[PDB]
Amino acid sequence: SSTVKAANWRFVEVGRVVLVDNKELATIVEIIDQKRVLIDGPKIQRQAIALAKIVLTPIVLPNLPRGSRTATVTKKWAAADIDAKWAASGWAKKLANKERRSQLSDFERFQVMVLKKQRRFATKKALVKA
Amino acid sequence: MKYIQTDQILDIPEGVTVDIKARVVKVTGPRGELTKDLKHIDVTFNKINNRAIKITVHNGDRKHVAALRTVKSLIANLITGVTKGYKYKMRFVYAHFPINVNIIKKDGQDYVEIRNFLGEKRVREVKIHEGVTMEISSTQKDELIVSGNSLEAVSQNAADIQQICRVRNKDIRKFLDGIYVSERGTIVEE
Amino acid sequence: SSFEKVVVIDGKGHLLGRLASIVSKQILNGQKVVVVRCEELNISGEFFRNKLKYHDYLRKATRYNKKKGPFHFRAPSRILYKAIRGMIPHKTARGKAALERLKVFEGVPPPYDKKKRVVVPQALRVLRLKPGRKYTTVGKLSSAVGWKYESVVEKLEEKRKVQSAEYYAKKKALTKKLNAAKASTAESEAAQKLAAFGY
Amino acid sequence: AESHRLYVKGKHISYQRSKSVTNPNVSLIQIEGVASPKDAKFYLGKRIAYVYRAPKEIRGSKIRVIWGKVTRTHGNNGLVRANFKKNLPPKTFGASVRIMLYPSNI
Amino acid sequence: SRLNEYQVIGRNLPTESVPEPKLFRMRIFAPNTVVAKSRYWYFLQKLHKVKKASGEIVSVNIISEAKPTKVKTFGIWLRYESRSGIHNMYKEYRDVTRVGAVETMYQDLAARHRARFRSIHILKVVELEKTDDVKRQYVKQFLTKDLKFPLPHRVQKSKKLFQATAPTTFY
Amino acid sequence: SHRKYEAPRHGSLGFLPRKRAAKQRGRVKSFPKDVKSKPVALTAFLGYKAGMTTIVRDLDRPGSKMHKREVVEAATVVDTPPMVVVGVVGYVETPRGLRSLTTVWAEHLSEEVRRRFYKNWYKSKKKAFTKYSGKYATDAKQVETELARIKKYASVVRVLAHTQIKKTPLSQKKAHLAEIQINGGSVSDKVDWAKEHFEKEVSVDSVFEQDEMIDVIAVTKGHGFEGVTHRWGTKKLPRKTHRGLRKVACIGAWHPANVNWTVARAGQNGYHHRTSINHKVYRVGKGTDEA
RNA sequence: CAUCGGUUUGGAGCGGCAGGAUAAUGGCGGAGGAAUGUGGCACGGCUUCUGCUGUGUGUUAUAGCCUCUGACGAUACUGCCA
RNA sequence: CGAUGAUUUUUGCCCUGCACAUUUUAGAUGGAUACGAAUAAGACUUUUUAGUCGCUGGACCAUAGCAGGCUGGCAACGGUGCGCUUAGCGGAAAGGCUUUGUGCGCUUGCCGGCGGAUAGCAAUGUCAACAUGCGCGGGGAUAAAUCCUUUGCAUACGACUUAG
Ligand SMILES: [Mg+2]
Ligand SMILES: [Mg+2]
Ligand SMILES: [Mg+2]
Ligand SMILES: [Mg+2]
Ligand SMILES: [Mg+2]
Ligand SMILES: [Mg+2]
Ligand SMILES: [Mg+2]
Ligand SMILES: [Mg+2]
Ligand SMILES: [Mg+2]
């Protein structure tokens, strides 16, 4: 066959889930320009934003009509359960682990070191025989 | 103006398998294989089916859009080169001095040797590019046939032969001698 | 942002003046910098344009004695060095010390062939230039104006990359074995607690 | 036990200056790992030590110290202004200083 | 600038001959009310025998966007001065607020015609309700059905000067 | 103002500075480019300028008015006894140029070449190369190790050879030792050729054939300090010029307010290093031939 | 080191109050309308109709949107807090 | 900038294992932590259709013990430091990267017993790599250059080519 390698880009389209401020989720509801979109979400304010200020996530909210108001976006977001889909990805998991690490205390860091010593002992023991 | 999207559709004949990976096109047909690097252009490819390939430019300005149909045409020339071939015919034009053209082989290399051009004692030699076949036509007097799979190589050999036979220090409107491309077609007639 | 003992920069794909300014501020502030692969550096603009600029540079020489005039160095590392030195107060003792903190090379000679090379994103050509613009490779500009050792460097760079590939294949193999050992000790008491701490 | 450091690494970068005139009474200090005025405001009021070696021993020691303190931030990239009891000599531009964790307010 | 749309109303000072002079309203795009009232008198003396000394400002009010989160297409009619003459032009902008389209216009004529704020008169700003009202292809290309486009060659901003891994531009 | 009339410059700016050569032995700046397919052979030879003579020769140049007719031609005799091979050097390609890696020497060096390494030979203990001569002790594996290093890493191989100056009428006893690059064959072939020729004589007939065109490297005749008139061939000033006439009248314009490097000045003339090319070999004579 | 007084630079500072179209929005309710027309329906090209899809129709259906509006409730912005 | 020859029979020189004391530092204070290439691209699995990873190093390694003391036990047969030792690779400035066996330690993988005070509420509160000298110990080698006379392939004088 032809065997053409295609790009795996993320598209600016109605229904794209985006991160805003590296904390909160929102979805694209309508495209303004090459540079600007209108975003909305359950926990964010409906606003016109520049695509440079947001990051497209690999998640699409399916069947979201163009220009949907806040109620429609919230209802379809709850139905598609976008929050759970986001929280199950390695991206959100790495963000959560970064936050959890940033909340450790000095005593907890000491415990982390001690447990790491124990796990390294076990790992070297397993590695030498395999 | 930054056109949002511009598209072109390749058409792949039945026996041809285009193959694109990282802007390196490899076209395979009954007549052989041809390859082309397009890394100097920002284009993306989508396989619609086995008979069509979409060529896209996203958010391209006037010149970058202009570089899109040329990509299409280059790949199309590759496609028709491995399924029909290319054939350029050259006619020998002289008023008095016959042009003596031979296909010689020196140092293991093929050359086109032009002698007696305008009576000159100089011997002109043109290297024959790889994948290009030269032939002295039997059906026509004073005709050279340049054929091959690659249109670029064939046309460039024809241009080399035409350019090496330029007339100097004369009225070229009067001294019309030279070797000129008379027919640009394909090996397989259609 | 850490203070390093030596920062070894892989110069491939870096824009000449942006890397030069960053390295100048680094060595002025007491940081030792090594730049390798200066033949893979980049200048924005087509090759012919930068070659014309270098020929404008070559025009300049002391009329009454050519030996006193500017000394036009042709090696890529020396082109980068001239760019950097133009950004340093090199006629003071402090600028001289800062310049002593710097080393520039073609290729990756020892001992840096077995050390870590970093990149400088603020000066990377693929991240800075608009994707349609034309650029020059300093290795090609150097050969066009008199540099003699282009083919020597590429022969030695292919030998280094063959050796560096053997390194990576070995390192990748031991990473695969260690990952399989860390998988065995997962879901253990130490591993479960470390997962609750974020590790 | 391989590490014993209780200070943050710093560097003496510059004096306070315009294009042509310098003010030795204020030093510009780069605290390691600080990249914004918000980060640098943790270190306001902390004591700074410049530790150096000298030819003559004083009480059996060839190590001398000039003490200072962080007074304010400088610019937008996390440098701070410091005030030392005796001005840091200009030869220390690029030399490392010690940013102490006291007076502590944690 | 960073602008607001103002309703400025003024009149000639009442006389014993004319004790209720006509009230004139203008829509002014100004950064603040000091420039809003200044621009008002600038245009009235282009249209009426009035001055700030012989007139009176009656009301200055901000006109807020009706639907600030509805994407619109605006047509703006302009009268600007070039280095050589005076020209009328019409351009179109996509935005969610009427004010933000005028702000884009000022940036755009600065960029494409070197036309400063002082050289521009806004004749009219109209929201184009029908897709057939859109004349310009640079905003008509965003009114197509099921519009999608990627953003190739993403450049990520780093907090550090040095990076230990190879740069990438996927997105 | 411009010159009233045009004239070419006096002398060449491509032979500056007109200073004394750093050494009396002319050094080969560039050797012939190496071709692997050729046999292993030397590219240079050292000789001594004996004198000039005259020959008579029939010219073979069709279209010339002297074709098939006798011409009388000046010729130079170069006394060239065979050179002795005593060493070999390996060179490595580096991004900074060729770099000598190792030098391997022969076991025995004659006294005439060991005098090369002395300023006061008669007052010396003559200790040169004695420990090195001991390096050949009963297995000579140090020498083989260095030769293997040359084979493994060198790209350019040059032999070390010295003249047998005792066979010439010169009263000088120091031999002349020079590096002569080996061309042809692989690096291993060159190293084997050099090793097998240690302490052997190599003749001119193994380097140069008759009718060859060869180049001559030498330091020219010294003339000492010379004025501009003969150093640079400038025009003598009129007879009635005050303070003398063997001068350059104007050594510069007012600006640049310096003397330029292109103006002819008095200085040392002769004793320069020259490379002279395309000298035809009319005869490679043999010392054993009585005719 | 502590506390004070004078001067001064800050905080992802916190709270209360006022004004405006007694913000404009949004959410909820009602009425009307259209298309870059959802479902459906009727023809098609590739699909074992596997976000299949295209073109017509028409007006909420198996998506929605726009305009006007009714009673509430916030927030932004700008001020004030002895 | 490199290769190479010879390096004082003087108590002088070289190499090396220590031990002590000194001078200096453009500035140690856990670790310079090694593919290459593309960027309109990379890398996994099936299938080349599709899904997944990145969206920064806030990472990775190391990190507990009088600046880290003295002792005991358990579990493992691992980790690590040093000393010999085996083999291989590295010439771009290799002067480094691996590796075999062995011995002596330590081990915080787990559980114990004893010690630190008073430097007084902080004062760098002194802990490093490079160099040199000096005492020992073990090996090792045993020169030239200049002036002077001479030469004339050189030359104003220096310098140069020679010879002694
Ligand atoms: Mg002409
Ligand atoms: Mg004529
Ligand atoms: Mg040159
Ligand atoms: Mg004379
Ligand atoms: Mg006179
Ligand atoms: Mg004259
Ligand atoms: Mg106070
Ligand atoms: Mg409302
Ligand atoms: Mg406020």
Tab-separated table of C-alpha atoms (C1' of nucleotides) in Angstrom, chain H residues 82-147:
chain	number	residue	atom	x	y	z
H	82	C	C1'	40.716	0.844	49.711
H	83	G	C1'	45.119	-2.520	48.220
H	84	C	C1'	47.001	-5.947	45.129
H	85	U	C1'	45.571	-8.453	40.676
H	86	U	C1'	43.395	-10.274	35.276
H	87	A	C1'	42.022	-8.935	30.470
H	88	G	C1'	40.200	-5.504	26.847
H	89	C	C1'	39.069	-0.899	24.555
H	90	G	C1'	40.358	4.474	23.859
H	91	G	C1'	45.705	8.858	19.808
H	92	A	C1'	41.257	14.637	18.402
H	93	A	C1'	44.253	17.139	23.464
H	94	A	C1'	44.345	9.121	23.834
H	95	G	C1'	46.318	9.960	30.284
H	96	G	C1'	40.407	7.771	30.512
H	97	C	C1'	36.445	3.837	30.146
H	98	U	C1'	35.519	-0.959	31.338
H	99	U	C1'	37.036	-5.819	33.383
H	100	U	C1'	39.045	-10.841	36.379
H	101	G	C1'	40.247	-12.936	40.872
H	102	U	C1'	41.679	-11.886	45.866
H	103	G	C1'	42.314	-9.648	50.704
H	104	C	C1'	41.109	-6.167	54.419
H	105	G	C1'	37.212	-2.994	56.185
H	106	C	C1'	32.294	-0.534	56.426
H	107	U	C1'	27.203	-1.477	55.479
H	108	U	C1'	21.488	2.803	57.385
H	109	G	C1'	18.437	-3.943	54.811
H	110	C	C1'	16.408	-4.774	60.282
H	111	C	C1'	16.900	-4.625	65.805
H	112	G	C1'	20.090	-3.258	70.315
H	113	G	C1'	23.748	-1.141	74.390
H	114	C	C1'	27.343	3.078	75.505
H	115	G	C1'	29.394	8.214	74.249
H	116	G	C1'	28.763	14.037	72.770
H	117	A	C1'	26.892	18.908	77.619
H	118	U	C1'	30.511	24.290	79.376
H	119	A	C1'	32.052	26.284	71.922
H	120	G	C1'	27.852	28.951	77.466
H	121	C	C1'	21.845	32.347	72.729
H	122	A	C1'	25.489	33.448	66.746
H	123	A	C1'	30.650	34.828	65.452
H	124	U	C1'	33.712	30.512	58.303
H	125	G	C1'	34.552	28.756	64.045
H	126	U	C1'	38.940	26.484	60.514
H	127	C	C1'	37.659	19.685	57.716
H	128	A	C1'	39.168	20.605	49.943
H	129	A	C1'	42.741	19.991	45.025
H	130	C	C1'	46.971	21.859	43.015
H	131	A	C1'	52.305	23.314	44.210
H	132	U	C1'	56.906	23.661	46.695
H	133	G	C1'	60.362	22.732	50.519
H	134	C	C1'	62.252	19.567	54.136
H	135	G	C1'	63.186	14.654	56.629
H	136	C	C1'	63.194	9.438	55.992
H	137	G	C1'	62.572	4.612	52.906
H	138	G	C1'	63.054	1.944	48.230
H	139	G	C1'	64.968	1.983	43.328
H	140	G	C1'	67.734	4.419	38.991
H	141	A	C1'	71.029	7.060	35.550
H	142	U	C1'	76.201	9.096	35.212
H	143	A	C1'	75.589	15.333	30.269
H	144	A	C1'	76.098	19.339	27.580
H	145	A	C1'	76.102	24.375	26.024
H	146	U	C1'	78.655	29.048	25.761
H	147	C	C1'	83.310	31.813	25.583
